Amino acid sequence: SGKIIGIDLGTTNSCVAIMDGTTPRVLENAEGDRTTPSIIAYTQDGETLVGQPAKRQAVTNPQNTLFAIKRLIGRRFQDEEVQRDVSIMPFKIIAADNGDAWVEVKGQKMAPPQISAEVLKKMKKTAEDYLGEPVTEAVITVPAYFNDAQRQATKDAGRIAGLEVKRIINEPTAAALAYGLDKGTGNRTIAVYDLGGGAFDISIIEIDEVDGEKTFEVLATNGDTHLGGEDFDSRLINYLVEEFKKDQGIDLRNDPLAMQRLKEAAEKAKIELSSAQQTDVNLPYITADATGPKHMNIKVTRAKLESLVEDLVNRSIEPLKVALQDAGLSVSDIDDVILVGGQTRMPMVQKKVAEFFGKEPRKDVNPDEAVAIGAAVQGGVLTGDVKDVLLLDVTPLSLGIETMGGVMTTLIAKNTTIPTKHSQVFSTAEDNQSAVTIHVLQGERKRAADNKSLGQFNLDGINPAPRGMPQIEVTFDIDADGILHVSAKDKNSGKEQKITIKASSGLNEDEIQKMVRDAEANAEADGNRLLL
Numbered sequence: 001s002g003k004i005i006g007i008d009l010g011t012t013n014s015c016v017a018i019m020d021g022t023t024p025r026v027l028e029n030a031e032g033d034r035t036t037p038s039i040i041a042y043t044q045d046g047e048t049l050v051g052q053p054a055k056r057q058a059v060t061n062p063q064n065t066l067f068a069i070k071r072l073i074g075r076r077f078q079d080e081e082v083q084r085d086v087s088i089m090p091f092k093i094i095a096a097d098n099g100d101a102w103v104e105v106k107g108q109k110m111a112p113p114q115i116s117a118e119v120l121k122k123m124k125k126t127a128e129d130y131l132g133e134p135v136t137e138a139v140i141t142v143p144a145y146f147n148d149a150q151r152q153a154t155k156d157a158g159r160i161a162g163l164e165v166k167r168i169i170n171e172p173t174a175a176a177l178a179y180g181l182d183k184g185t186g187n188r189t190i191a192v193y194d195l196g197g198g199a200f201d202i203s204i205i206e207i208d209e210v211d212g213e214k215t216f217e218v219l220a221t222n223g224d225t226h227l228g229g230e231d232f233d234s235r236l237i238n239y240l241v242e243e244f245k246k247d248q249g250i251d252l253r254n255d256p257l258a259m260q261r262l263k264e265a266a267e268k269a270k271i272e273l274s275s276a277q278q279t280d281v282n283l284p285y286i287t288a289d290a291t292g293p294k295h296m297n298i299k300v301t302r303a304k305l306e307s308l309v310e311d312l313v314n315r316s317i318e319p320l321k322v323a324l325q326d327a328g329l330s331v332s333d334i335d336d337v338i339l340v341g342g343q344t345r346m347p348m349v350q351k352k353v354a355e356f357f358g359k360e361p362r363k364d365v366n367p368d369e370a371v372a373i374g375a376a377v378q379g380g381v382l383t384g385d386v387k388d389v390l391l392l393d394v395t396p397l398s399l400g401i402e403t404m405g406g407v408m409t410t411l412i413a414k415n416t417t418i419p420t421k422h423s424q425v426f427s428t429a430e431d432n433q434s435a436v437t438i439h440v441l442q443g444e445r446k447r448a449a450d451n452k453s454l455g456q457f458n459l460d461g462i463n464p465a466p467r468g469m470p471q472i473e474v475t476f477d478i479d480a481d482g483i484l485h486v487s488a489k490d491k492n493s494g495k496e497q498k499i500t501i502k503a504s505s506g507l508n509e510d511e512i513q514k515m516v517r518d519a520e521a522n523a524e525a526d527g528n529r530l531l532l
């Protein structure tokens, strides 16, 4: 087995922690850094770079430097978010054979779980170097608002990296574990607002101590898995592209090398503007034309930055309201506001959040490391080293089936505690109907057509009978990772026959095993309602 390490696999930065006895501990990587860039680069010389070495050559090799893959993992190629990023990213995003979003580097097509596995592999090696023994088990983090496919593809990424994924933990829940292990015998209700490089979560969580045992219960969660600092940077990049075009007549978007330089300068400027009132983007020799070489030199004030991204910040406030509604609490029921994630260092974000809650956020939380610490505490709860700690999480989205008339029937509502087993009995719509179609849906809308479709299977062999009489029991089962299986069985089957499916499109076992072996090639180289 070995130690169960905790990995914060982030859109921008990743971080690994372990239990040092009863104390969680973040690990420096080989470069001496407590976090590692989630960046994967393939060189012309054919080496695979992860982290800071990948980062520092991105400007000379943008097309084969992969980043922000957490914004693609488990997504369909036809996702509106993916379609937007196809034009924006320097690397090649393509459709896999099953329609998932994939990436092509130097002619080879790659599943995002393979790429993320490179980051996980680095984090795995970092712990091994520290511990001086192999690591094969891990808790890996995902955004609370990750859907089923995104969770499953992240779990695959860990398997491809040689890790047995003992738990997929939602990122605000990990942050709550890290925050609440310290504090004593005081009942607390907390709001965890996690704005990162790629995702945004809000979770409302109660921490109660029954008698010596701390219970962590998510009351509600919400967010946006494609809202993050990458979007703040993009707004600044577009403004710099526009300002340079206006007073120089050159559109830098044709130039992938200039755009990689521009992306890096914009993120640097954004960051400096969290403590300064103004700063300069200086890019010498950014381009050239018939009149000669050209340089970008433009002042960016905090005020300009704030107007460029204010609606992104406001976009994070609306999920807060829904989360308080689903928890049935007002802002004054919230004892502590916790800001997690690098993008929460922006003063405007801090000000908007504090104003909404009417309360200043806690300062005794590490916004870069609380998620990793919590992943590691989770692993100590699983082994048993951490005791008297109970975790009660939820699933974020409403899930059900289509019943007769295009109607979505919900078997699991958003914010139901997990693991979950919800069953309901359905019947045939016609007479002597020999099969029913089980069509799985995710969403809140009344019509089945307005929700997202997740999968479908048919349960056949229903004995001919009047309409409404057969008893078809459909069961929705969600495990501790937030991943869903859907079952249907005819209650009068002699052998009690039941069909079960996974809820999401993803890798099959042939692909994973091939990718697992490619990952060791690289490591040696280095009833009432009616169913139609």
Ligand SMILES: Nc1ncnc2c1ncn2[C@@H]1O[C@H](COP(=O)(O)OP(=O)(O)OP(=O)(O)O)[C@@H](O)[C@H]1O
Pocket (backbone or CB within 6 Å): 009, 010, 011, 012, 013, 014, 070, 195, 196, 197, 198, 199, 200, 228, 229, 230, 267, 270, 271, 272, 274, 340, 341, 342, 343, 344, 345, 346, 367, 368
């Ligand atoms: N001082 C700062 N001011 C504003 N933004 C910052 C600052 N420092 C870092 N950031 C931004 O924070 C983001 C990274 O935050 P973090 O490392 O928490 O993200 P992550 O956990 O990798 O992403 P996610 O949780 O969304 O998957 C980047 O967009 C970065 O530009």
Ligand SMILES: [Mg+2]
Pocket (backbone or CB within 6 Å): 010, 011, 171, 196, 197, 341, 371
């Ligand atoms: Mg994060």
